[model samples]
Target: LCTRDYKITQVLFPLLYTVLFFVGLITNGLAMRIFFQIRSKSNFIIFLKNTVISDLLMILTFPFKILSDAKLLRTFVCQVTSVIFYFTMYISISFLGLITIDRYQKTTRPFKTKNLLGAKILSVVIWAFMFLLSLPNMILKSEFGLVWHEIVNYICQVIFWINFLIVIVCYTLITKELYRSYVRTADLEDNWETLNDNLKVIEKADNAAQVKDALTKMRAAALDAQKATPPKLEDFRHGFDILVGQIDDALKLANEGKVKEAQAAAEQLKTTRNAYIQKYLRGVGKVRKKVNVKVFIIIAVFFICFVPFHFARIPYTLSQTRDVFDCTAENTLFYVKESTLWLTSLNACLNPFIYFFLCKSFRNSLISM
Candidate 1:
């Protein structure tokens, strides 16, 4: 009977989904509240606002999915919920792209920065567009019957290929841009290292000079050390600047209907900013270092939890059409997918911890708020 293993699976899935939903909701809500309470106007704040909003939307969809899985809801409910889920997922992924681009621009264009900071009109337009783009899923997504062992189950699919194609293209561009940004950052670091080496040679020469001139040379060496040394705080500031600038650019680009470009830029900014911030936090004092370590662990947990699930679908789809792979592993794939969903859901809840504990600004804002 369907009442045995299937019922157990259904119940367990929904329970796990609920846990993820609450975690994401509470953490993302706290993040947004802390950000707004600060009353500070900056690009970084705007970026944080967008991230929190995306996480909240993702959390909202979980309840619907949970209900669907538990009760085997009607086609209409499934369709609506699936539409909302996919739309929010698209927005969340798009915002990640925006964050990466912002970091790249900040690192490369510090002097001639052209960011769209605090553009309320533009921000509204972006939200509107996200809604509009998501409308197709609401209109075109439908549930089809899947027959197995004389049992019928409903599965939702979007009929619009164009929409799917557009999303693929957007993500591809984002990936490319992020890779380029990483390369550029590496090159810059290499140049800095080379300069440092030259300074060291000059310092050695100064040490061997005559006593009268040695003092002058020593002072010059000290000045060189000051110039060559990278400040711990500056690394964070640089990342912060990049994140804000990219958020501004994303809003402006979205207003101009350059949605694809904006998506790519945003993704690049988020990835690059995270990398820089992660690096900076690694060099701090013991207590601060522990905080950063926790943040890194959280990030690693997110990647571990999500990546396998994302990849599992690929093999599942391939196995359905051709028996080239082990069809016996289907149950394993299902478990992986479920695990991924739960992990991804946990991200929304854990993000606030990263900010509250790891981010100085967020902690200060909380105290002041």
Candidate 2:
């Protein structure tokens, strides 16, 4: 029944797991220590503490999974390792949802000091519930005779989607609130503040007028720089040197009374010049594009690391639980599942960057360290 299609993933999966294992371990370990040093006990911090804990636990299971993927472990051990891996990974995701909710509440409410006791108890309940769900997977490792396994798999998949919806809705509301406040502030600034400040400052000093002109000039330059396209031949010094050598060769041939050869060299040099000009000077071209780095990472990490795995999971689970798929199709499903799972594992390594980008204090703490 085995189609040799898994040979690539066998090598690739372990190689990727090894990298994820070390990188996740180091980052999550540091996060663990950092969380400890933070004396604050807000619900957000509590959720973050548990998030790091789950990430560390999930990361620690990677070596075992790597060995399992490489077929270097017994079936029972492999089953247990996988059960643990999925358990903590989902727990980590649940904590991420809790963190998102906490962020939303802070943004919208801004004054309510939520109960720390609830966060602590909720974290415990999450651990207990997920552990309870995953325990049977370890116990039923040897057999899948019952439909209960499929039910559990679907429930886990549903949990991820529920949290995904939570994050999306919360962020959309948060963005709306932010935009409303920004518009109100802009109206207030325009009506009352800007004219008063400028008039008073300009009336007091002539130097202020000159400084204002300089500021306007600087702003114009900055805006222009943003719109300017970067030079395509910016790093073509070698090509320029070769062009200069070609010109010298043509000139030297002419001086030596080799008219025909000089003309040929001149034609070749003109062709090279036109090619370089065409490449480097192709109209004004599109202006340089800029991206919001943090937002890009947030969206990219979600899509790249999590979405593909969840998309692969349903079909993969169906193939496991049903007799509808043939060996070739099932083998292909397994390959996709394995590949996406590696990407899902990479989220553990990538999450610290999310923390760094989103949390100013975390960024400061990391930089100071």
Candidate 3:
């Protein structure tokens, strides 16, 4: 019965809201409960708690919103719901930004242990601060002027965009770092192949002694790897396995006139070379594509869920002198404002899943709980 545009929201908005509300409440409650049960909860859990509380409050408020919107609630109930909804929304956004900064600090500088505040007091302070700031929507009823609200909303917009921009910049740097590693590994692989081919030529010429010398030089080259400190003892074991298994396989296959098998062996060594390079990076708290390949998902989610709410919302405010859009355009903006609220609500439910997937320890703790 739901058509694309007209009947879509009529059919889907409540369905969407119901899903976000129930799912978000269940997941955040479970995650928060899990954190509480743990005796050794870390400082980062403060931010995580804030995030769970912030978004859980918003999701819990959604049922009240439906009743208020339908005018089934009293005027006082409606106003209270409105205040708490926007209040939790702003608090939710703030905590989400905090989570990002927390993650950045952990990943970028794991050595720098920053005990910014004691966890219990920190949670208290955050709750108190957000509650204090959010009081205005309940207290200030009139004559605050449209400009004031716009300024507050604009500041919130800027805050969200700044967080959005930070992640974008992060992804760019991650991609660049990973690409450089790939290039370096590719070069190392090419050198290995060239030496391999020359060694084959020496074997064909029946230069057994020369082949022995060539192999000794290869061992020296392997020993002189660019690792700042020498690699761990296991690196040698993995490296020798690849060198012997691959070279012999390639050489044997080529000797039997099987170009395809020889090529497959060469490809395996190429893969092994990249694996070594990746291992070196991991040794230093540096990960490439393995760590942040899902950055694009973050970007896409933000743009899809937040941008329309920003762009297509009311073009003119209560204090605007000039009309950005005529009466016809105003109707469209009103409709957009209505629909995009649903899109925005979807974001409230999405972040906990992101954390669940991206973090293994957190995921394990949560599932174990």
The candidate scoring highest on TM-score is 3
Candidates, ranked, TM-score: 3, 2, 1
lDDT value for candidate 3? 0.59
Best first by lDDT, ranked: 2, 3, 1
Candidate 1: list runs displaced more than 4 Å.
1-8, 103-114, 118-129, 141-302, 317-327, 357-359, 367-369
Q: Candidate 2 lDDT, tens digit per residue, 1-369? A: 556635566787788889999989899878777767776568877877777877887788888888877877377777787889889878877887787777666655534335888889999999999998887777652446257677777888888899878878876776676666666445533433332343233234333333344323323332332233244543333443444455456456655656556545545634766456424422422211112354345545666777888877666555455454577876776778878888888878987877787666677787888
Model 2: residues with Cα > 4 Å off, grouped in runs: 5-7, 110-114, 140-145, 178-300, 314-321, 324-328
Could you tell me the C-alpha RMSD of candidate 2 in Å? 19.3
Off by over 4 Å in 3: 1-6, 39-41, 68-76, 110-126, 145-147, 197-290, 294-304, 311-328
Report the error of model 2 at residue 264, Å.
Answer: 71
Q: 112-209, model 3: which lDDT tens digit per residue?
A: 34364665676676567656755665546466735556665776677567776776676576568667768766655554555556555444544344
Output the lDDT of residue 136, model 3: 68
Query: What overall lDDT goes with each candidate model?
Result: 0.52, 0.65, 0.59
What lDDT does candidate 2 reach at residue 290? 16
Of the pair 1 and 3, which is ahead by TM-score?
Answer: 3
TM-score per prediction, in order, is 0.50, 0.64, 0.65
